[PDB]
Design an enzyme around this catalytic site. Structure first.
Site, PDB file in Angstrom:
ATOM      1  N   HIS A 164      42.580 -17.333 -37.078  1.00  0.00           N
ATOM      2  CA  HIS A 164      43.169 -16.253 -36.296  1.00  0.00           C
ATOM      3  C   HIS A 164      44.599 -15.917 -36.695  1.00  0.00           C
ATOM      4  CE1 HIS A 164      44.233 -19.738 -33.542  1.00  0.00           C
ATOM      5  NE2 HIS A 164      45.324 -19.035 -33.301  1.00  0.00           N
ATOM      6  N   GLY A 203      52.817 -21.424 -30.564  1.00  0.00           N
ATOM      7  CA  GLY A 203      53.320 -21.866 -31.844  1.00  0.00           C
ATOM      8  C   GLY A 203      52.641 -23.111 -32.372  1.00  0.00           C
ATOM      9  N   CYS A 222      49.355 -23.818 -32.645  1.00  0.00           N
ATOM     10  CA  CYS A 222      48.080 -23.677 -33.330  1.00  0.00           C
ATOM     11  C   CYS A 222      48.199 -24.110 -34.780  1.00  0.00           C
ATOM     12  CB  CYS A 222      47.602 -22.232 -33.251  1.00  0.00           C
ATOM     13  SG  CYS A 222      46.931 -21.893 -31.631  1.00  0.00           S
TER      14      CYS A 222
HETATM   15  C1  LIG Z   1      47.839 -20.498 -30.936  1.00  0.00           C
HETATM   16  O1  LIG Z   1      47.242 -19.250 -31.271  1.00  0.00           O
HETATM   17  C2  LIG Z   1      49.227 -20.392 -31.477  1.00  0.00           C
HETATM   18  O2  LIG Z   1      50.026 -21.323 -31.204  1.00  0.00           O
HETATM   19  N1  LIG Z   1      49.673 -19.268 -32.191  1.00  0.00           N
HETATM   20  C3  LIG Z   1      51.004 -19.120 -32.714  1.00  0.00           C
HETATM   21  C4  LIG Z   1      52.061 -18.313 -31.891  1.00  0.00           C
HETATM   22  C5  LIG Z   1      51.398 -17.651 -33.130  1.00  0.00           C
HETATM   23  C6  LIG Z   1      47.834 -20.472 -29.356  1.00  0.00           C
HETATM   24  C7  LIG Z   1      48.240 -21.840 -28.744  1.00  0.00           C
HETATM   25  C8  LIG Z   1      48.186 -21.827 -27.230  1.00  0.00           C
HETATM   26  C9  LIG Z   1      49.187 -20.833 -26.604  1.00  0.00           C
HETATM   27  C10 LIG Z   1      49.813 -21.552 -25.391  1.00  0.00           C
HETATM   28  N2  LIG Z   1      49.507 -22.998 -25.541  1.00  0.00           N
HETATM   29  C11 LIG Z   1      48.577 -23.118 -26.573  1.00  0.00           C
HETATM   30  O3  LIG Z   1      48.118 -24.234 -26.953  1.00  0.00           O
HETATM   31  N3  LIG Z   1      46.487 -20.175 -29.103  1.00  0.00           N
HETATM   32  C12 LIG Z   1      46.027 -19.077 -28.456  1.00  0.00           C
HETATM   33  O4  LIG Z   1      46.873 -18.281 -27.936  1.00  0.00           O
HETATM   34  C13 LIG Z   1      44.548 -18.797 -28.346  1.00  0.00           C
HETATM   35  C14 LIG Z   1      44.160 -17.913 -29.592  1.00  0.00           C
HETATM   36  C15 LIG Z   1      42.645 -17.624 -29.717  1.00  0.00           C
HETATM   37  C16 LIG Z   1      41.824 -18.931 -29.883  1.00  0.00           C
HETATM   38  C17 LIG Z   1      42.329 -16.633 -30.866  1.00  0.00           C
HETATM   39  N4  LIG Z   1      44.172 -18.066 -27.193  1.00  0.00           N
HETATM   40  C18 LIG Z   1      43.994 -18.673 -26.041  1.00  0.00           C
HETATM   41  O5  LIG Z   1      44.092 -19.934 -25.965  1.00  0.00           O
HETATM   42  O6  LIG Z   1      43.693 -18.018 -24.905  1.00  0.00           O
HETATM   43  C19 LIG Z   1      43.047 -18.702 -23.884  1.00  0.00           C
HETATM   44  C20 LIG Z   1      41.796 -17.899 -23.463  1.00  0.00           C
HETATM   45  C21 LIG Z   1      42.141 -16.438 -23.241  1.00  0.00           C
HETATM   46  C22 LIG Z   1      40.591 -18.097 -24.377  1.00  0.00           C
HETATM   47  S1  LIG Z   1      41.335 -18.685 -21.806  1.00  0.00           S
HETATM   48  C23 LIG Z   1      42.674 -18.474 -20.579  1.00  0.00           C
HETATM   49  C24 LIG Z   1      42.553 -17.416 -19.659  1.00  0.00           C
HETATM   50  C25 LIG Z   1      43.556 -17.199 -18.702  1.00  0.00           C
HETATM   51  C26 LIG Z   1      44.691 -18.031 -18.637  1.00  0.00           C
HETATM   52  C27 LIG Z   1      44.824 -19.100 -19.563  1.00  0.00           C
HETATM   53  C28 LIG Z   1      43.808 -19.310 -20.522  1.00  0.00           C
END
Ligand SMILES: *[C@](O)(C(=O)NC1CC1)[C@H](C[C@@H]1CCNC1=O)NC(=O)[C@H](CC(C)C)NC(=O)OCC(C)(C)Sc1ccccc1
Ligand SMILES: *[C@](O)(C(=O)NC1CC1)[C@H](C[C@@H]1CCNC1=O)NC(=O)[C@H](CC(C)C)NC(=O)OCC(C)(C)Sc1ccccc1
Lengths: 299, 300
Positions: free
Chosen positions: A39, A141, A143
């Site tokens: 992603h 951050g 991921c």
């Molecule tokens: C990861 O993408 C990342 O660190 N990206 C860096 C900044 C560019 C994050 C890590 C998450 C963010 C907060 N704490 C963490 O561990 N991962 C994501 O943002 C996920 C990305 C997807 C897999 C493509 N998205 C995500 O985890 O969303 C959660 C949901 C929407 C699947 S479930 C949910 C719904 C409502 C409230 C909380 C969670």
């Protein structure tokens, strides 16, 4: 007993950052390949429902910024394997350890090296829960941060971080990009299923108590594995596998207490409670120490 | 989420070596051209019962010390003693030497421990310096010379070297100048620690962590003065809270909208009533080995 991580240096020497556009994730640099969550290629608008194959076909090697610290590592090839992107780079990591990629089972523990922009921030021990989440500590951050075990000099990578769920628990993939659990790499509402207690680790904990002289809970009885599993499920405990029975073997040999006799003791605890007593100075039964963790901290 | 988190240990791993004198093998810390290790490496089992270390050391020669960095022996070309630490000068600098300093930590502060055996890193975990100057570590035979540290930017601040396990299973050691934390001595004689107390400022930080992660059954509508809270704290063998502590909790107070003295009123209630079989962040006990800085860093 302490949650103890593996020393993180061998993994620190493999952490890089991967940037597409303004999106920076962590990656893992082993030999001349960098592994990271696919992603990284998504915009916020793609994230809501990404077509990863289409997104990737529009990418070229020169769209990926890979950096070790602030030193750019040039990308010379790219491919997608399930939910991980593999970027071939023109430099073999001189710090590559002996390694393998493993897929762990629920109940197994591993160390997480939490990283931000390729920079390690902290290390801690985690257990894979039966519902295929981990109770981690991760901020935006993180991921691409990885989980691992170290055996002799060999690093077994078992987890790459992708997701934080509504209950504050975490989900991710193995290093072949296959999620643990039913989760998908889309920004659409998801939730952790109902969790259960890791029975094999509770047993390991009881063995640890016995090793340390705390053995009031041992009884004169035994059970069959099937009778125990049927009872355990009514207390939201995982059933035992043959592999669980096997990995308890060393502790059973160390204490002289057959696995099924310890299961009978645990059943009595489930059915009757602690009646106000403690085990290893706790009124709670611990389920995130594996049999390996116990031997590693007792002997 | 919220975990006990250690600093990445790589910078310290590249400094760990094995030191053998006679039949005693333990760990040393190799910085530039000096290896630091506990001085009791020079003792026989008979010496250990009552060691006159200056007398014992003058009878040693450089060649009595075997230092190994992996497969490679390092030649000792000089030695000296600083309090309970032995300093072995070797003929080669450690290229892996990080930027570093030696600090003496205060009770209540946390640090990471890199537990090592035979010069090989085995595990890493976070510990607090207890008010009674012990630490609740996980150390086995062979762990002596393992160190504790913090990392700030690229600088490793070494604060602990491991020497002893007391009858209660807690641990004791020195700073990197060789001075013990606490009233302990590096002789093989039974030693007990003073009565311990709970690190109140850390308990409050951890309650703030529990709120940040949605666990707030223990809050209440009440408040307390600082002095009235401290009276109750001392009754229960908790350390007093200073105004410096209140200030350090400020950011966590800001982040949650819970005034520090309001959180003190909640802790007062927990001390007086207990947890009624409930848990906070999964613990049945009030946790006191997270500092305010530990919590902010993780929950920012
Ligand atoms: C990861 O993408 C990342 O660190 N990206 C860096 C900044 C560019 C994050 C890590 C998450 C963010 C907060 N704490 C963490 O561990 N991962 C994501 O943002 C996920 C990305 C997807 C897999 C493509 N998205 C995500 O985890 O969303 C959660 C949901 C929407 C699947 S479930 C949910 C719904 C409502 C409230 C909380 C969670
Ligand atoms: C350290 O010397 C070491 O690892 N040496 C390597 C094996 C050659 C050990 C570390 C201890 C061992 C068990 N867990 C540990 O952390 N240190 C010592 O053995 C101490 C050496 C002194 C400083 C000369 N001795 C020691 O810790 O003994 C404890 C007592 C006697 C101070 S108190 C006591 C009394 C009865 C029962 C338990 C403890």
């Amino acid at each position: 007993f302490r949650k103890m991580a593996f020393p993180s240096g061998k993994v620190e020497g493999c952490m890089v950052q991967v940037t597409c556009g303004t999106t920076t994730l962590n990656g893992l640099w082993l030999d001349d390949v960098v592994y990271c969550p696919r992603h990284v290629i998504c915009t916020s608008e793609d994230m809501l429902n990404p077509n990863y194959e289409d997104l990737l076909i529009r990418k070229s090697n020169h769209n990926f910024l890979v950096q070790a610290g602030n030193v750019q590592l040039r990308v010379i090839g790219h491919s997608m394997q399930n939910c991980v992107l593999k970027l071939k780079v023109d430099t073999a990591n001189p710090k590559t350890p002996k390694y393998k990629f493993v897929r762990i089972q629920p109940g197994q523990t591993f160390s997480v090296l939490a990283c931000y922009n390729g920079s390690p921030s902290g290390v801690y021990q985690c257990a894979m829960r039966p519902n295929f989440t981990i109770k981690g500590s991760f901020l935006n951050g993180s991921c691409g941060s990885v989980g691992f075990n170290i055996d002799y000099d060999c690093v077994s990578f078992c987890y790459m971080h992708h997701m934080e769920l509504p209950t504050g628990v975490h989900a991710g993939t193995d290093l072949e990009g296959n999620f643990y659990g039913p989760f998908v790499d889309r920004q659409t509402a998801q939730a952790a299923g109902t969790d259960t207690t890791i029975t094999v680790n509770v047993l390991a904990w009881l063995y640890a108590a016995v090793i340390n002289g705390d053995r009031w809970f041992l009884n004169r009885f035994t059970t069959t594995l099937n009778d125990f599993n049927l009872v355990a499920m009514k207390y939201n405990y995982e059933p035992l596998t043959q592999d669980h029975v096997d990995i308890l073997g060393p502790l059973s040999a160390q204490t002289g207490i057959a696995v099924l006799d310890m299961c009978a003791s645990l059943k009595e605890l489930l059915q009757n409670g602690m009646n106000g007593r403690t085990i290893l100075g706790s009124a709670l039964l611990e389920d995130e120490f594996t049999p390996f963790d116990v031997v590693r901290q007792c002997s």
